[PDB]
Amino acid sequence: GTGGIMMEERSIEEPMEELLEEEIPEEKEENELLEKAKEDILNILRQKRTAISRKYILKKLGDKYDEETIDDAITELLAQGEIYEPETGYYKLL
């Protein structure tokens, strides 16, 4: 539309409320740690190129990353489809 997104119906979701325009909360998280965590897990999985136990991963990276961070990393990798579990508790990088 002209200036704003006004359609056939008068779409005025943009009001004259100067009390609050948008003001987006800054969510600038340093996800580098999680990136390195996933990368490290992938390095481990790649090193043997076999299905590695999730508990073994938690054990091995226990001195390198927090369990929670490892869990998020695993979940991210699983969601990204880079790893899969052919057996319960065992994960394999594709």
- Show the domains of the chain with their CATH numbers: 32-93 (1.10.10.10)
Ramachandran angles phi, psi of 25, nearest 5°: -60, 130
Residue 7 in tokens: 């359609």
User: What is the rounded radius of gyration, in angstroms, for the C-alpha atoms of the chain?
Assistant: 22
Answer for the pair 57, 41: CB distance below 8 angstroms, yes or no: yes
Sheet holding 52-53, edge to edge: 52-53, 90-93, 83-87
Cα(15)–Cα(81) distance, integer angstroms: 43
For this PDB entry, the determination method is: NMR
Q: In the structure encoding, which two tokens stand for residue 51, read together? A: 């299905």
Spatial distance between the Cα atoms of 8 and 73, rounded to a whole number of angstroms: 47
d(CA 70, CA 38): 8
**How, if at all, do strands 52-53 and 90-93 pair?**
antiparallel
Read off the tokens for 55. 């508990």
**What stretches of the chain show up as alpha helix (H) in DSSP?**
32-48, 54-60, 67-80
CA distances (Å), 56 to each of 25, 39, 41, 67, 94, in order? 39, 16, 11, 11, 18
Q: Which helix (H) or strand (E) holds 52?
A: strand 52-53
First to last CA, the chain: 47
* Contact (CB, 8 A) for 49 and 25: no
